[PDB]
Design a protein around this ligand. Structure first.
Ligand code: NA
Ligand code: NA
Lengths: 300, 300
């Protein structure tokens, strides 16, 4: 304390949330989601993905979403670009920021995407090069930062290594992803300390799944270490494949509740945020995955 | 850090959890619950209540539960005793520890129990006197420690005052109850600091509702302040009247997950704890209210 005075909420609801929901939704409702999120005062929203809709029907129509949304000038509207043709499709949509991904666990790399950590990093060089040419900034995600669903323990120096590779490839920010939600507050702080030996805290974000109920305590522990960017999903959209669809991403309203309570500035309006989450859950619907949102809705 | 090396989990599932579930259950299943909890290695279980079953059918048969459970010698099996006749009934059942209650908010006191804070404290003097005569120890709960559902902000000095009254009346331990779940990590630490001016940390416990998703972060913040006793409900039994039955007590497995992750000793076995929670939720059932338990169950 020693806490940040200002924090960035990275809203991944429309991409990572919707992607991990079983029910695909209409382009008109995705547009409304993003527009509701922009109305909530968020300055970073992951709008969609240029993964092949063949594999992820939930992400179909991302281009139409980009064309339909009312884009506010101070807000970044990012998209996942998993390969070159995905990047090119994103370019065609006027996307100014994309995200790529890597894993801290070799075993997880082999299982999730059928190659090693290095193979996948090298696969992304072409897209870093093209993004660099078109001045599209690239965010780098790491999975398994606090443990692997196959291998168990993940050494934080291993995470530090991949974080370093990603920043040295041209990623402007590295998102540390506890992507099975197994991490606890102390290991989280040690992880930040190990990674900060290679990449400064100001290029670091925390991406904490709430599958084991640990996400907010992890965020608080992260705040204590000076991390000021956190990825969350509005109304807790949707789940985890390793825990039969139980809770995935931490819910944005839960995080905002913490941050408001700490009197930390985010620029995000709770009522509007909750309103956005409510509308999309009804479309789904899906009972709201945010405890804070439900409680606030019940209260009103 | 500066963390405790050892923490007490106060299991309130059978009383506070079951009480706040809509479905009353059979005495045979309550006995099995408590027995499963004793098998999990818990050394403190709130077994039942001697509130009038007229008002709380969920608590009917508490005496039969006490008579039926296999009581392990090193374990405290506590009961709620809301008045003198409740205490006497508890005495008749061989109860060695009871809990009384108070509120940090006058407005909440008037609404919840139709008298002031002082009126209710005085009402409890007779039961403190009788418990003192029979060497039954008394635990004191405080509600609204981090905010009141009617009044809003609760000054931590006000909580400190009631904590002091309770210890000076003969309560051996005071449980600080964020009983609407509105508290956040920073206000939690300031609360502990204010209360510790009047009553030492070693007579303090944290009773954090998870209604707003804040409970574990609050517990972590509490650990950082040296609090080493936390009240939780196995499999997150059951809810909150101020949030239309949404999450009440923090779930025990969630807390244990944190504590195991911090390598803090509790003596509690996760597999057995989860097993107890699973069995009771099926009886209810009720999908498990513990994220950690669900994730662990899915994994197995
Ligand atoms: Na994720
Ligand atoms: Na309670």
């Amino acid at each position: 304390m020693n806490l940040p005075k200002k924090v960035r909420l990275v809203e991944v609801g429309p991409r990572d949330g919707l992607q991990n929901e079983k029910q695909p939704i209409e382009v008109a409702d995705k547009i409304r989601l993003v527009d509701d999120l922009s109305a909530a005062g968020l300055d970073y929203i992951e709008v969609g993905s240029f993964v092949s809709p063949k594999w992820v029907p939930q992400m179909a129509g991302s281009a139409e979403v980009f064309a339909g949304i009312r884009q506010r000038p101070g807000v970044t509207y990012a998209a996942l670009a998993p390969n070159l043709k995905g990047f090119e499709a994103a370019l065609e949509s006027g996307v100014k920021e994309v995200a790529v991904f890597a894993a801290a666990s070799e075993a997880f790399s082999q299982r999730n995407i059928n190659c090693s950590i290095k193979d996948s990093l090298e696969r992304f060089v072409p897209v870093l090069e093209a993004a660099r040419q078109h001045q599209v900034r690239v965010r780098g995600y790491i999975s398994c930062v606090l443990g692997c669903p196959y291998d168990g323990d993940v050494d934080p120096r291993q995470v530090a290594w991949v974080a370093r590779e990603l920043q040295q490839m041209g990623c402007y920010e590295v998102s540390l992803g506890d992507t099975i939600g197994v991490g606890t507050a102390g290991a989280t702080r040690r992880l930040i300390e190990a990674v900060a030996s290679e990449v400064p805290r100001e290029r670091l974000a925390g991406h904490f799944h709430d599958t084991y109920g640990q996400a907010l305590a992890n965020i608080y522990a992260s705040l204590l270490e000076g991390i000021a960017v956190f990825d969350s999903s509005v109304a807790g959209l949707g789940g985890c494949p390793y825990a039969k669809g139980a809770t995935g991403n931490v819910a944005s309203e839960d995080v905002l509740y913490l941050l408001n309570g700490l009197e930390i500035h985010t620029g995000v309006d709770m009522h509007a945020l909750v309103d956005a989450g409510q509308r999309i859950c009804a479309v789904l619907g899906k009972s709201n995955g945010s405890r804070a949102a439900k409680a606030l809705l019940a209260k009103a």
